[PDB]
Design an enzyme around this catalytic site. Sequence first.
Site, mmCIF file in Angstrom:
data_model
loop_
_atom_site.group_PDB
_atom_site.id
_atom_site.type_symbol
_atom_site.label_atom_id
_atom_site.label_comp_id
_atom_site.label_asym_id
_atom_site.label_seq_id
_atom_site.Cartn_x
_atom_site.Cartn_y
_atom_site.Cartn_z
ATOM 1 N N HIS A 282 3.304 5.527 -17.941
ATOM 2 C CA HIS A 282 2.585 6.373 -16.955
ATOM 3 C C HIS A 282 3.331 6.480 -15.626
ATOM 4 O O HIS A 282 3.152 7.456 -14.890
ATOM 5 C CB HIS A 282 1.084 6.080 -16.747
ATOM 6 C CG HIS A 282 0.686 4.654 -16.862
ATOM 7 N ND1 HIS A 282 0.537 3.839 -15.765
ATOM 8 C CD2 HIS A 282 0.310 3.918 -17.932
ATOM 9 C CE1 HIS A 282 0.139 2.643 -16.155
ATOM 10 N NE2 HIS A 282 -0.005 2.665 -17.469
ATOM 11 N N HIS B 207 4.974 1.368 -7.297
ATOM 12 C CA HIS B 207 5.278 2.475 -8.193
ATOM 13 C C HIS B 207 5.090 3.772 -7.438
ATOM 14 O O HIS B 207 4.632 3.781 -6.308
ATOM 15 C CB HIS B 207 4.387 2.459 -9.441
ATOM 16 C CG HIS B 207 2.938 2.619 -9.115
ATOM 17 N ND1 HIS B 207 2.131 1.549 -8.795
ATOM 18 C CD2 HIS B 207 2.166 3.729 -8.942
ATOM 19 C CE1 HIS B 207 0.931 1.980 -8.473
ATOM 20 N NE2 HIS B 207 0.928 3.304 -8.562
ATOM 21 N N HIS C 125 4.049 8.228 -7.898
ATOM 22 C CA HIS C 125 3.557 9.401 -8.606
ATOM 23 C C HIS C 125 4.356 10.591 -8.109
ATOM 24 O O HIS C 125 4.656 10.652 -6.917
ATOM 25 C CB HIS C 125 2.064 9.626 -8.342
ATOM 26 C CG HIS C 125 1.221 8.423 -8.621
ATOM 27 N ND1 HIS C 125 0.539 8.242 -9.805
ATOM 28 C CD2 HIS C 125 1.003 7.303 -7.886
ATOM 29 C CE1 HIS C 125 -0.090 7.074 -9.780
ATOM 30 N NE2 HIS C 125 0.169 6.484 -8.628
ATOM 31 N N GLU D 187 -0.810 12.155 -4.790
ATOM 32 C CA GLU D 187 -2.222 11.966 -5.203
ATOM 33 C C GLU D 187 -3.150 12.260 -4.022
ATOM 34 O O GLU D 187 -3.971 13.174 -4.066
ATOM 35 C CB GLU D 187 -2.394 10.544 -5.734
ATOM 36 C CG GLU D 187 -1.570 10.335 -6.952
ATOM 37 C CD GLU D 187 -2.114 9.302 -7.880
ATOM 38 O OE1 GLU D 187 -2.335 8.148 -7.461
ATOM 39 O OE2 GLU D 187 -2.291 9.610 -9.063
ATOM 40 N N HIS E 170 3.050 3.831 -3.977
ATOM 41 C CA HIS E 170 1.939 2.880 -3.916
ATOM 42 C C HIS E 170 2.461 1.467 -3.979
ATOM 43 O O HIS E 170 3.002 1.057 -5.008
ATOM 44 C CB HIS E 170 0.967 3.120 -5.077
ATOM 45 C CG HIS E 170 0.228 4.403 -4.935
ATOM 46 N ND1 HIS E 170 -0.452 5.035 -5.967
ATOM 47 C CD2 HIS E 170 0.051 5.166 -3.835
ATOM 48 C CE1 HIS E 170 -0.991 6.142 -5.497
ATOM 49 N NE2 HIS E 170 -0.720 6.236 -4.203
ATOM 50 N N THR F 172 -6.175 4.798 -9.119
ATOM 51 C CA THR F 172 -6.083 6.234 -9.445
ATOM 52 C C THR F 172 -5.720 6.483 -10.895
ATOM 53 O O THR F 172 -5.586 7.625 -11.269
ATOM 54 C CB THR F 172 -5.075 6.940 -8.543
ATOM 55 O OG1 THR F 172 -3.752 6.456 -8.865
ATOM 56 C CG2 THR F 172 -5.431 6.740 -7.062
HETATM 57 C C1 LIG Z 1 -7.536 -4.265 -15.124
HETATM 58 C C2 LIG Z 1 -6.887 -3.218 -14.281
HETATM 59 C C3 LIG Z 1 -5.674 -2.576 -14.841
HETATM 60 C C4 LIG Z 1 -5.823 -2.375 -16.314
HETATM 61 C C5 LIG Z 1 -4.516 -3.469 -14.618
HETATM 62 C C6 LIG Z 1 -3.231 -2.755 -14.464
HETATM 63 C C7 LIG Z 1 -3.003 -2.120 -13.137
HETATM 64 O O1 LIG Z 1 -2.510 -2.757 -12.217
HETATM 65 N N1 LIG Z 1 -3.375 -0.751 -12.989
HETATM 66 C C8 LIG Z 1 -3.209 0.000 -11.785
HETATM 67 C C9 LIG Z 1 -2.675 -0.502 -10.597
HETATM 68 C C10 LIG Z 1 -2.555 0.349 -9.489
HETATM 69 C C11 LIG Z 1 -2.986 1.691 -9.582
HETATM 70 S S1 LIG Z 1 -2.884 2.825 -8.204
HETATM 71 N N2 LIG Z 1 -2.193 4.218 -8.738
HETATM 72 O O2 LIG Z 1 -2.038 2.133 -7.187
HETATM 73 O O3 LIG Z 1 -4.271 2.963 -7.783
HETATM 74 C C12 LIG Z 1 -3.516 2.149 -10.782
HETATM 75 C C13 LIG Z 1 -3.609 1.317 -11.873
HETATM 76 ZN ZN LIG Z 2 -0.484 4.660 -7.976
#
Ligand SMILES: CC[C@H](C)CCC(=O)Nc1ccc(S(N)(=O)=O)cc1
Ligand SMILES: [Zn+2]
EC number: 4.2.1.1
Length: 257
Positions: free
Chosen positions: A61, A91, A93, A103, A116, A195
């Site tokens: 992703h 990471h 987007h 986002e 992020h 997100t």
């Molecule tokens: C249990 C929760 C999750 C499966 C564990 C994995 C994880 O860290 N997911 C994650 C982290 C950051 C964002 S964002 N885009 O920064 O809001 C989106 C998704």
């Molecule tokens: Zn993110």
Amino acid sequence: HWGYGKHNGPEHWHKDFPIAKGERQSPVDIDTHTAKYDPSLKPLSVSYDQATSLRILNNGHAFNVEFDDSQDKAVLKGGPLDGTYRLIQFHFHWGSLDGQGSEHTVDKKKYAAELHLVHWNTKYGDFGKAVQQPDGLAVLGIFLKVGSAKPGLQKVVDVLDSIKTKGKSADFTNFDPRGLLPESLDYWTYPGSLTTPPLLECVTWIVLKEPISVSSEQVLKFRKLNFNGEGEPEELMVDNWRPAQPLKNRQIKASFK
Ligand SMILES: CC[C@H](C)CCC(=O)Nc1ccc(S(N)(=O)=O)cc1
Ligand SMILES: [Zn+2]
């Protein structure tokens, strides 16, 4: 499984993750004229001098640069936060075109990409516990616009060839995330969510006002990544962003006038 395509994208996520239609979802549009200065907000404290990066992973992703979060080494404090939040990963987007990819939006403006930096509240002991709490995470969001190169990004760009496909990782030690920050730490803040699924409502968002500039060649290299695994049909990893969600009963606060 969820993703960013026509048949599994953001408009579908609510079927597996009903919180997608919840009361504090992210991202949102930041209406700069309606955000209110909060003179009681403190300056952010970003202490990344002892950061220990370990690895970079294509998770299908996005790609995550992961850090050692087993001690207080790279922490975010202050601003709207109570307590100490440890950096676990960053990471991005990004879009298929320079005119989209972020986002969050600012007065409906979309940036080319959004970084992020994800941190978790040490009072909850580990990340998995933290995501179950309303104040579990603090995510520092930084917009990217296309113009001059960001020199501190280049080491990230250059390793992407080695993690082209889902499930690939590479060693990525000694990377200094301070090279990804803009000059100003002026920010907006609001309560929100992850997100991506599972869309948990555990994040204090802190979104910097000042974007960083990256070159067209840098973002082009992001767009050569793949959502798919090796030996599967090639699907370029582009447009891995969730659009703005309703603000509902929230106020966005500004740290600056
Ligand atoms: C249990 C929760 C999750 C499966 C564990 C994995 C994880 O860290 N997911 C994650 C982290 C950051 C964002 S964002 N885009 O920064 O809001 C989106 C998704
Ligand atoms: Zn993110």
